[PDB]
Each structure stands twice: as structure tokens, then as C-alpha cells.
Design a protein around this ligand. Structure first.
Ligand SMILES: O=c1[nH]cc(-c2cc(-c3cc(Cl)cc(OCc4ccccc4)c3)c(=O)n(-c3cccnc3)c2)c(=O)[nH]1
Ligand SMILES: O=c1[nH]cc(-c2cc(-c3cc(Cl)cc(OCc4ccccc4)c3)c(=O)n(-c3cccnc3)c2)c(=O)[nH]1
Lengths: 305, 305
């Protein structure tokens, strides 16, 4: 029992982190097989990032201008190319620690683990969610660019995120491992709106099921609702609309606890309309939306890797 | 910017986790050099744990009765001994992945990372605190015994915790790596009180400094206090007393933010007396005590490993 914001074990990713240097810029890269992936703004100076022409900046760069260091190991760069917003550096040595892996583009509302890195060295790991507006509320300092987010299924690392930018609002933006930004953002230091964020309704419900499984039951009430009525309330409190697809994903938690999804929606409705009245749920005084239904079943049933 | 409950990268510990089997009992062990450490109740049956005589139970066990498996690798057991509440199994092979390490006994209020494991396989990592009453509020299921807690300093893993028990209250108890329980607990399924817990005042203050560093400033007020007056309030709200030693550990955060420790105490006093009035601090609607001053400086300055 107990419920914690738990991250995937990071060892399989730690073995892939390298340092990438181009000119006077140093950041983090991801070394898989014989390719190193990193944000393309490694080729920019402080002035370039205000309005960069990456095509033109890269043309002034040759293979020997990229220094890639993996601990002591200096890697020899034998090719370079730009794919959307990431640079791909071909090296002459395959990473001996390459895990089984794939590149995935996650959906808004999905969670992943972040291995924050500086100068190629891992400093910490934490779990976060892709917001509905495609930002993430991370913990990143200067030098963290090229840190990656991932999930793990038994032995296969699914890389979903590479960190590129901190917006003036303090939230974070980045790409999938094909270099495509999540959300509307561009890798340029110029004004960019993230737009309205909402709460991930299906995750909140998943966490309420986790609370019930662990003994926190005070919020269960005598009411039910309909999907239509609930979505009226969701809209009023800037919650994402709940779909039948979401109801179905919640099916196994509903079965395990014997609480129909729509009954749990009614409990959530009453928490939104009346607040938590100075109480806590799973040690939290607000409604938590960073656990997916899969996360809750994983943590509450102890699946391993 | 941003502030997250961040855990140490777990790779160095993942390489040390093995499965230990004795009879029909299987749990987690820690393989360092040529020794495997695990809870001594691996030798108990379900009935034994109600009132075990570990000396007598171990006498019925021989080296070949302990099966130790590290992935595929079956380890050959050439010695066994009991040290307080842990078993030490001498194996004939040194773990090739042994990190630099030491065994440390932490103080109440200190934080560490937990690598939750099942059947020798890591499933997740999270950060927690040793409570003032020497329990931890973890996330552990049956089979998690022998999972370990640790800190990391550059390349040296300090192991501080091995998980042994879940109490009927749902909180968790365990030992240092010499087998000595934290707190009053014994490895026996019989009634055991944990006693009153308090909030870790110095950690709360550290987190308020983290909030200020990140831009959450609404809680700073026009008041100051004295150490004596603050400790009166702390006692009323079951906060740990603040000592001059604590004030000194907070010195660098005070210097960085220009906010005198006693001024921050006055802000904390007003939050305790008046509540948070429906506001949040660093995304939390309650006062958070699981970050030490060292944690806050580490996360806010990006030290790595
Ligand atoms: O050597 C290196 N140089 C640079 C970086 C670097 C670079 C950026 C960055 C990159 C681009 Cl292309 C545009 C941009 O715009 C911000 C903005 C957007 C919109 C409006 C105003 C400003 C920012 C950054 O955000 N961070 C950082 C800092 C703290 C936390 N997380 C990431 C680090 C690095 O890590 N290493
Ligand atoms: O094979 C295996 N067998 C057993 C275990 C095991 C064993 C215990 C345990 C061990 C002892 Cl000596 C005494 C005890 O008392 C509880 C109690 C104390 C006071 C009053 C009433 C009850 C419990 C346990 O707590 N957990 C567990 C379960 C869930 C989360 N975290 C840990 C697992 C295992 O992991 N693997």
C-alpha cells in the first residue's frame, strides 16, 4: 500500500547519455546504436537563437566540429544530418549499452519519466505528464537541453521526449525523437503562446480509484451522474471532456473496486463543486492528474522490468 | 525552473538487485562485491513470522538452501550469516557491477531514493523521507521486501535503507544495511506502535526557499519572529523544533534569496495559523516537508552524478 509519483528505473537510459559540443555550446545527447541525437540548437550562439536559420548555420559545420564525449570515451563523428529539430550525428562506434528501444510520439495526457542531465551526466529522475496544451511542467536548468523522457515495457525503452526550451512562463517544450515539437512551438527565442491548459479528467479519475484501493474513501458519495451531465461540469472547471473511450480504459479499475465509472464521476463532480473541505486524498490537498489508468494498475499490482 | 520530487538516477543500484529464495519464500537481495544482503525473514514461513526464533530457524538452513539469481546468473552460495535483522550470503562471484558504495545510517528527516523491486527486478524509483518517528510513507506491495533506499554523491552510492515490513497502518519500516531497524520495530507480525509523527520543520523552510527561488512569493509577509516564539507555534502544530543547527544549514538559501531564516519562520508561522487560503505553493496545496536544504540547493543548482 501507499501511492507515490513513481518513475521508471533509469539505468537503461543512463547508459545512453553523452555530452555534445559544437563551438562553445554544450548540451546532452542520446547515443543509440551508432547515432547520437540532440537538439539542433547546439549549433547556435546566444545571438543566433533570437532568429536562427538552421539550414545556413549547419552548412558552416563539418563532422569534426561536433565533439561527442561519453564519459572518457571520445566518439568519432563520421556523419551529420538534420531531421526536423534534432541533429543526428553518425559515429563510428555502436553504443555497447544500447537497450531495446523505439521512438514513440505520445498523446496529451500521457505520462513519462524524465532523466534530467547536465554535461552528459544524469542528475535526477522524475515522473511527469504531457499537458493537454503540449507543455510539460518539469524541473530543468540551463544545460538540461537534450535530456529525454521515456517509458519502459519490460526491457524496451520507448523514448518520447527530448527537452529543448523553457518558455518565459517557466514551463517546458520539446520534441519527439524525430525532432517534431509537441504543440505549436518553434526552436527560436521569440514570443510563443502555449494556450489554455486543462486538467486530465481520465487521470484524475484513475487516481481516485487508486485512493479507494488504498483506503482513502471519504469522497465516495450517494450520487451518480450521466456522461453528458458530468461533461457539463468538466467544461465549467476546465477539465478535459470524458469520452466513452476513457470510460473503457477505466474499466479494469471499475471492476476491481466495484465502483461504476459514472458513480466515480459523480464523486469527482461533488469535489469540483464543493472542494476538498480541508481534507486530503493520498496525501494531496488538490486533485492529482499525473497518473494514467495504466500507471495506477501498474503501481497497485507491482509490474516490473 | 520548476521543482519536482526528484530521485537519484537508479542505474548503479539496478545492477545490484538479485532474487533470493529460501524454501518457498522469495524476496529481493542486494549484491555488493561477493556478499548478498537481504531481510532475515526470507527464512520464515507465513506461520513463523507470527513469533519467529530466527536463531533456531537459521540453524535448520544450509548454504545450498539459499538460491540467489541475478537475471540468468545463478550464484553459488558459499557462506551465510545473520547480522542483526539481515542475512549476509557469501557467494563465490564478485558482482562485476558493484558501484563505489558505503553503508550509512541516516537521521530522521533525511531523504533518500527507493528502488522498488519485485522478484529481483526493479519496477520504479521514488524519493521519500525518513519520518521523525522512523517510518517511511512508501509505495510497497507484497514481494517488495529487500528493496533498498539510497543517496548518491557523484559516483558513490550510500545505502541507507532496506525494506522489511508494512505495518497495519499502511506505513513502512526497515533497517540500515547492518540490519538495525530504524525506530522501535522488530521483524515479527505482532502489534507495534509507531508513535506520534511530526512535520520536518527545516525541510518545510527549505521548500519555502525553493518556492521563492522559482517565483512563488505570495506567502512572504511583513513580519519577523524569534526562534523561541516560532518554536511555540511549531509545538502547537506538531512541527519539529527548529534548532540553531537547522538555522545554519539554511544559511546558503538565506544568502541566495536575501531572506533571513527568522523572516521565513514568520511567513511559515502565518501559514500555519491562517492556512493557505485556497492557494498553492510549487503546485502543492499543503506544506511539503520531503525536501532537505541540500536537496533544494542540488535541484536549484543542477549538481550531477
Ligand atoms: O549550451 C546551451 N545553450 C542553450 C541551452 C538552452 C537553450 C534554451 C532555448 C533554446 C531555444 Cl532554440 C530557444 C529558447 O527560447 C526561450 C524563449 C522562448 C520564447 C520567448 C522567450 C524565450 C530557449 C533553453 O530554453 N534552455 C533551458 C534553460 C532552462 C531550463 N530549460 C531549458 C537551455 C542549453 O541547455 N545549453
Ligand atoms: O516471500 C515473502 N514473504 C513475505 C514478504 C513480506 C513480509 C512482511 C512482514 C514481515 C515480518 Cl517479519 C513481519 C510483518 O508484520 C506485519 C505486521 C506488523 C505488525 C502488526 C501486524 C502485522 C510483515 C511484509 O510486511 N511485506 C510487505 C507487504 C506489503 C508491503 N510491504 C511489505 C512482505 C515478502 O515480501 N516476501
Amino acid at each position: 500500500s501507499g501511492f507515490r509519483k513513481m518513475a521508471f528505473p533509469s539505468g537503461k537510459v543512463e547508459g545512453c547519455m553523452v555530452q555534445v559540443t559544437c563551438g562553445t555550446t554544450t548540451l546532452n545527447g542520446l547515443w543509440l546504436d551508432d547515432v547520437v541525437y540532440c537538439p539542433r540548437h547546439v549549433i547556435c550562439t546566444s545571438e543566433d537563437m533570437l532568429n536562427p536559420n538552421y539550414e545556413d548555420l549547419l552548412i558552416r559545420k563539418s563532422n569534426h566540429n561536433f565533439l561527442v564525449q561519453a564519459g572518457n570515451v571520445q566518439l568519432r563523428v563520421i556523419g551529420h544530418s538534420m531531421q526536423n529539430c534534432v541533429l543526428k550525428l553518425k559515429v563510428d562506434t555502436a553504443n555497447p549499452k544500447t537497450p531495446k528501444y523505439k521512438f514513440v510520439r505520445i498523446q496529451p495526457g500521457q505520462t513519462f519519466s524524465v532523466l534530467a542531465c547536465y554535461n552528459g551526466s544524469p542528475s535526477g529522475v522524475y515522473q511527469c505528464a504531457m499537458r493537454p496544451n503540449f507543455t510539460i511542467k518539469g524541473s530543468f536548468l540551463n544545460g538540461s537541453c537534450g535530456s529525454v523522457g521515456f517509458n519502459i515495457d519490460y526491457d524496451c525503452v520507448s523514448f518520447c521526449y527530448m527537452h529543448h526550451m523553457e518558455l518565459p512562463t517557466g514551463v517546458h517544450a520539446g520534441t519527439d525523437l524525430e525532432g517534431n515539437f509537441y504543440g505549436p512551438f518553434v526552436d527560436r527565442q521569440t514570443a510563443q503562446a502555449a494556450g489554455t491548459d486543462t486538467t486530465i479528467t481520465v487521470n484524475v479519475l484513475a487516481w481516485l480509484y487508486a485512493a479507494v484501493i488504498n483506503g482513502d474513501r471519504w469522497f465516495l458519495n450517494r450520487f451518480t451522474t450521466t456522461l453528458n451531465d458530468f461533461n457539463l461540469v468538466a467544461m465549467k472547471y476546465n477539465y478535459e471532456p470524458l469520452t466513452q473511450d476513457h470510460v473503457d480504459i477505466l474499466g479494469p479499475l471499475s471492476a476491481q473496486t466495484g465502483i461504476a465509472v459514472l458513480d466515480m464521476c459523480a464523486s469527482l463532480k461533488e469535489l469540483l463543486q464543493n472542494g476538498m473541505n480541508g481534507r486530503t486524498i493520498l496525501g494531496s490537498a488538490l486533485l492529482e492528474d499525473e497518473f494514467t489508468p495504466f500507471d495506477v494498475v501498474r503501481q497497485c499490482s507491482g509490474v516490473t522490468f
